[PDB]
Amino acid sequence: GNPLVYLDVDANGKPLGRVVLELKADVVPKTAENFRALCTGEKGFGYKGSTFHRVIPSFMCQAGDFTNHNGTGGKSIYGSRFPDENFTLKHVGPGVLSMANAGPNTNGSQFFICTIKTDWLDGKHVVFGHVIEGMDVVKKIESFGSKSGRTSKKIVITDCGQLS
Numbered sequence: 001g002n003p004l005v006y007l008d009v010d011a012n013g014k015p016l017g018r019v020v021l022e023l024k025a026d027v028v029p030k031t032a033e034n035f036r037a038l039c040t041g042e043k044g045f046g047y048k049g050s051t052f053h054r055v056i057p058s059f060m061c062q063a064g065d066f067t068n069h070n071g072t073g074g075k076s077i078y079g080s081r082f083p084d085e086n087f088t089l090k091h092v093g094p095g096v097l098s099m100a101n102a103g104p105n106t107n108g109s110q111f112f113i114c115t116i117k118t119d120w121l122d123g124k125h126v127v128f129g130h131v132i133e134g135m136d137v138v139k140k141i142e143s144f145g146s147k148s149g150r151t152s153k154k155i156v157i158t159d160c161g162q163l164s
């Protein structure tokens, strides 16, 4: 019942590989549907050709600001922002897919993939999926990050979509 979506990612134009994500529509259907639709681009906008703007090694890889490309932008398929659906899923370890926000009830399109357990975020960021394959691709993305979050190469989602 849960969608599988994919991100194909490159660094300075050179392909890194494919990340496949399960979206937990069974637990957070509104939040899963937002991410799913932004991967397909079927509302006329989405993640295709946007960047991972903030990458911090031993923490997470953040992306999804397709409007401003600096982490101050992005929007949902519902409107500019939508409520925190629930906090049932937890930041249990590497590969967890969660929503970036600017406080309670400010979910747009920005998201992050954890490269460690980020349990401090539990109850503050809505977890809505995890990495099914391509965690080696996430580590490659991670390697181009820095402690400050600034990336050493331009990391781009060159293509994305839905597998099932």
Ligand SMILES: CCN1Cc2cc3c(cc2NCCC1=O)OCO3
Residues within 6 Å of the ligand: 071, 072, 073, 074, 075, 076, 080, 081, 100, 101, 102, 106, 107, 108, 109, 110
């Ligand atoms: C809160 C301002 N703003 C943009 C935005 C920026 C973010 C974020 C979520 C959003 N929400 C979508 C629309 C919106 O209202 O997570 C971290 O940076």
Ligand SMILES: O=C(O)CN1C(=O)[C@@H]2[C@@H]3CC[C@@H](C3)[C@@H]2C1=O
Residues within 6 Å of the ligand: 054, 060, 062, 071, 099, 100, 101, 102, 112, 121, 125
């Ligand atoms: O984008 C922002 O302005 C704040 N922001 C981040 O820098 C990342 C890490 C800290 C919380 C989660 C993970 C995500 C987020 O919302």
